[PDB]
Design a protein around this ligand. Structure first.
Ligand code: SF4
Ligand SMILES: [Mg+2]
Ligand SMILES: [Zn+2]
Ligand SMILES: [Zn+2]
Lengths: 435, 181
RNA sequence: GGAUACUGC
DNA sequence: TCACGCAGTATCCTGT
């Protein structure tokens, strides 16, 4: 307590309840923000790489906390000025990051996760004395049953909880809940009831503490997102907070490539029309969406592809999310009856809605006039003999055989070796042959 | 969009453009003010650090003068009216251009521009930040030894000037009470 | 592509 | 035996 200190920072760990009221410098603001961003990113990386109970996790996290000079260990000496400084850092940095990490739900979740992890670690480093001190300073009042009451009902608790050993029971702490909330436990008589309260078991205490913390933190983030307009007007802090998350401290593109070789002629025609006009009638939308689902395009990937393709068609960006998002979701069984709709089978495509003027769906071999099919086959550099054979097969009403002949000619294979009965089968065979 | 630090060598007179604390890669990396940009020139700008200080102050004065000139340009492409006079007639978005009466006047050199310029001048002299962020691992090791302590001290002194200037800027205190309520 | 609602002027 | 026009926004679904 040198010059301008106080009792504002009693303990190392805190729930970050009271916002700071000081006037800090812009340099201090930026330094604290970046430092805590580094700390949280380190926490995330170590959580991904290691098990949070592992000793490697603890060692690396201690090293990072020491490197960035954040409070991580207690000190049974007093509130030394340096210690005070560190705690102040922690307290301000946290709230700064709150301002950075409240704009989007994703961000919020990320922040919460990292914070919880850090808090857990710090709790894990608290000596029992310190632990109690903390539990008192925040009015948590865990002696959660007291130790004295636990000894008072020791035998009852021992006989209440199934498979609880004497010493192991001594190592556990219970909670008092109104019996109306423990219905599923009381009903089969697996928890002791005393005076209208059940004594429910949880090492475990950290869990309860964390639960409380998480509740509080979520609430706080909501409030911060509600108080965002006041901060956006401060240009000084806009470049930082708006972009802190992005601060240095199958692919859609290949789809076109696939359309060159693997796509069956139906999908090739649909893709050509889509890239020519950036818009497809309903039948084409359904067929192409189901096919792209079949090849593996994930819901996010398909949404991105359709958004990008349609936006060029001189339509509002919001209109896409308003209208076509539901259809795209439904094709993947996300809404409505929520069924994983399978890709169209060749029989369905042939016997599905008959295409009309302005449409491009359906099987070209069936829905294209022989002259048009001949022209298309010639365009693809197919040998004259192959084109004649394909036309002859088409005249025989065996369009599936025509597609098999197309596959044989285009892939330079004497025999297809498979009974083509699904466009996804066509694409899979092409991928197997090429890759 | 910030102008880089131009310093003319007293000996050879060739312009030296400084945009980072360190120049070069690997063990060949050294502070920018250690050697002149002209290979035939052996003069070290670190020798004329008084001149570098004076040029830095003159540049800061130039940028402050640019900001306080208060030049406004109409945002309309078909007007692009340029005036020094701020009119009292305001729309919801800001001053109304008196040439067309239908578009807003925007500052040619806003406060953010000056703040970013001063921050860049601080950046091009931030030894510690460059070591931590910009510099690599082997380069950091090569630069974190002796033979550069004097350069480090001179760079700290030069950064002190920009820090002093920024301490007097209202774009240098953050009121946390106003942010968190 | 379709189906179900109800506002406006 | 019946029943006014058209322009526009919002929500939801597509297996045997
Ligand atoms: S036979 Fe099947 S895969 Fe081939 S073009 Fe017709 S619908 Fe497409
Ligand atoms: Mg439509
Ligand atoms: Zn020179
Ligand atoms: Zn104008």
């Amino acid at each position: 307590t040198g010059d301008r200190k106080g009792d504002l920072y009693p303990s190392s760990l805190q729930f970050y309840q009271h916002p700071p009221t000081e006037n800090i410098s812009l340099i201090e603001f930026e330094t604290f923000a970046i430092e805590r961003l580094k700390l949280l990113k380190a926490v995330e990386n170590l959580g991904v790489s290691y098990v949070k109970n592992s000793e490697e996790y603890s060692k690396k996290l201690e090293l990072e906390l020491r490197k960035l000079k954040f409070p991580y260990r207690p000190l049974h000496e007093e509130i030394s000025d340096d210690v005070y400084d560190l705690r102040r850092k922690d307290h301000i940095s946290h709230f700064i990051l709150r301002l950075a990490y409240c704009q989007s739900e994703d961000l919020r979740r990320w922040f919460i996760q990292q914070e919880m992890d850090l808090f857990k670690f710090r709790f894990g480093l608290l000596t029992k004395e310190s632990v109690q001190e903390f539990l008192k300073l925040n009015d948590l009042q865990y002696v959660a049953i007291s130790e004295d009451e636990k000894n008072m009902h020791k035998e009852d608790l021992m006989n209440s909880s199934f498979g609880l050993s004497l010493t192991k029971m001594e190592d556990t702490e219970f909670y008092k809940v109104p019996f109306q909330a423990a219905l599923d436990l009381v009903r089969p008589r697996k928890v002791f009831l005393w005076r209208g309260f059940a004594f429910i078991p949880h090492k475990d205490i950290v869990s309860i503490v964390l639960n409380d913390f998480r509740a509080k933190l979520s609430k706080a983030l909501a409030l911060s997102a509600r108080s965002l307009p006041v901060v956006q007007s401060d240009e000084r802090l806009q470049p930082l907070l708006n972009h802190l998350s992005h601060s240095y401290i199958i692919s859609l593109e290949q789809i076109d490539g696939f359309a060159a070789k693997s796509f069956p002629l139906c999908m090739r025609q649909l893709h050509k029309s889509l890239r020519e006009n950036h818009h497809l009638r309903h039948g084409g939308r359904m067929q192409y969406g189901l096919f792209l689902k079949g090849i593996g395009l994930t819901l996010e990937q398909a949404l991105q592809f359709w958004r990008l393709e349609f936006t060029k068609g001189k339509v509002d960006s919001e209109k896409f999310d308003k209208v076509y998002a539901y259809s795209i979701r439904h094709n993947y069984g996300k809404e409505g009856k929520r069924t994983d709709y399978t890709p169209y089978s060749c029989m369905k495509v042939i016997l599905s809605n008959p295409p009309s003027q302005g449409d491009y769906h359906g099987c070209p071999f069936r829905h294209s006039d022989p002259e048009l099919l001949k022209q298309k086959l010639q365009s693809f550099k197919v040998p004259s003999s192959g084109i004649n054979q394909i036309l002859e097969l088409v005249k025989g009403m065996h369009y599936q055989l025509a597609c098999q002949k197309y596959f044989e000619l285009t892939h330079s294979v004497d025999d297809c070796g498979f009974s083509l009965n699904h466009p996804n089968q066509y694409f899979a065979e092409s991928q197997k042959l090429l890759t | 969009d910030c102008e880089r630090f131009k310093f003319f060598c007293p000996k050879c007179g060739t312009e030296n453009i400084y945009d980072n604390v360190f120049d070069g890669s690997g063990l060949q990396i050294e502070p920018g003010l250690k050697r002149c940009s002209k290979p035939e020139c052996d003069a070290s700008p670190l020798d004329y650090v008084i001149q570098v200080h004076n040029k830095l102050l003159l540049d800061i004065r130039r940028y402050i003068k640019k900001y306080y000139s208060g030049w406004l340009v109409c945002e309309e492409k078909t007007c692009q009216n340029r005036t020094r006079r701020l009119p009292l007639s305001f729309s919801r978005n800001g001053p109304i251009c008196q040439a067309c009466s239908k578009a807003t006047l925007r500052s040619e050199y806003p406060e953010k521009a000056l703040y970013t310029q001063l921050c860049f001048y601080r950046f091009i002299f931030d030894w510690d930040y460059a070591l931590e962020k910009v510099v690599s691992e082997q380069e950091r090791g090569h630069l974190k030894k002796k033979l550069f302590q004097e350069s480090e001290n001179q760079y700290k002194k030069l950064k002190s000037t920009v820090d002093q200037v920024l301490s007097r800027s209202g774009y240098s205190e953050v009121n946390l009470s106003k942010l968190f309520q």
